[PDB]
DNA sequence: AGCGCTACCACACCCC
DNA sequence: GGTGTGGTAGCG
């Protein structure tokens, strides 16, 4: 449907031996996706913002290893963002925020974990798939203004189709608390002008979403997201890479781990 | 040389 | 009111 508005842009677009590592930059999204598909080795798209105040974003495209290679550090590579790729089969995940000056009353750590205990009876009900808090990566960002906290389910051989179906799922099961805008009250936070917002943020679930990676910050400020302090879920130790390592790519949404006996989990609207 | 929508206006009809 | 446009600021 939407392919053919994408070569419309590149029509729009007209008036405008060493060792084996794959580094390409892409200033066009597009561009980026392209070589992914005429290229062999497990490649992705990650997003890096550029000096720009605004959210002017160029594209690299490299595997995983080599990416935490040159970003392990922390001293380059700031301010990353994984490019959710759309149609791709990918985890569930959650962006949970509300701004504190304006939600006094309400405890961040109470809150998130009643939203996993909902979310797990959900994923029992509609799916049969059985998990608990000890499967979702606990990711924080806070600071003395925004409670900010990112969720990345770790469902054992289960998937979902993509992130549109994430969303579905989403909005399905937090119906009833959408309609306050059984005892889904405790998602309901008020934002700064006063509103009455859901602690759940529904629009990080579209088509090449960008979500920011584990241990990067957002151009403007500096808190890079961490692992939770109450996190409890521990990758599997493993000699021939770091724990960090195992975190990142336990924090990829898009990096599903693979299986003979994948469960890939629809939802339609 | 970012990307991809929703939310929110404006106005157009349509019918008791 | 009820519903269908349809174009943009503005958000994530
Ligand atoms: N102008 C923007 C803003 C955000 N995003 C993407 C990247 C983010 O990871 C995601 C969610 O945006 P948030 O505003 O929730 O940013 P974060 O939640 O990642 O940071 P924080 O919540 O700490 O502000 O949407 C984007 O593509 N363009
Ligand atoms: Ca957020």
Redesign the pocket.
């Known amino acids: 449907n939407?392919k053919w508005?994408?070569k419309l842009?590149q029509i729009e677009?007209r008036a405008?031996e060493e060792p084996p590592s794959i580094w390409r930059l892409?200033?066009?999204?597009?561009?980026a996706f392209n070589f992914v598909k005429s290229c062999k080795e497990d490649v992705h798209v990650f997003?890096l913002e550029?000096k720009?105040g605004?959210?002017?974003?160029?594209?690299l495209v490299t595997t995983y290893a080599e990416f935490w290679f040159y970003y392990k550090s922390r001293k380059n590579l700031l301010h990353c963002?994984e490019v959710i790729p759309?149609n791709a089969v990918c985890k569930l995940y959650f962006?949970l925020?509300f701004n504190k000056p304006a939600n006094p009353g309400a405890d961040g750590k109470k809150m998130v974990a009643l939203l996993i205990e909902y979310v797990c009876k959900a994923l029992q009900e509609l799916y049969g798939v059985n998990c608990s808090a000890e499967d979702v990566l606990n990711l924080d960002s806070s600071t003395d203004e925004k409670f900010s906290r990112h969720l990345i389910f770790q469902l054992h051989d289960v998937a979902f189709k993509d992130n549109?179906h994430v969303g579905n799922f989403l909005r399905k099961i937090l119906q009833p608390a959408l309609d306050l805008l059984p005892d889904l009250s405790f998602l309901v936070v008020k934002?700064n002008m006063g509103?009455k917002?859901l602690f759940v943020?529904?629009?990080?679930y579209?088509?090449?979403?960008?979500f920011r990676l584990y241990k990067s910050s957002k151009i403007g400020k500096r808190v890079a997201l961490e692992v939770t302090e109450d996190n409890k879920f521990f990758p599997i130790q493993s000699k021939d890479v770091s724990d960090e390592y195992q975190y990142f790519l336990s924090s990829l949404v898009s990096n599903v781990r693979f299986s003979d006996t994948l469960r890939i989990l629809t939802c339609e609207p």
């Open positions: 939407r508005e994408a842009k677009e405008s892409f200033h066009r999204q597009a561009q997003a550029c720009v605004d959210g002017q974003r160029i594209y963002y759309e962006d925020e549109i934002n509103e917002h943020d529904l629009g990080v579209t088509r090449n979403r960008n």
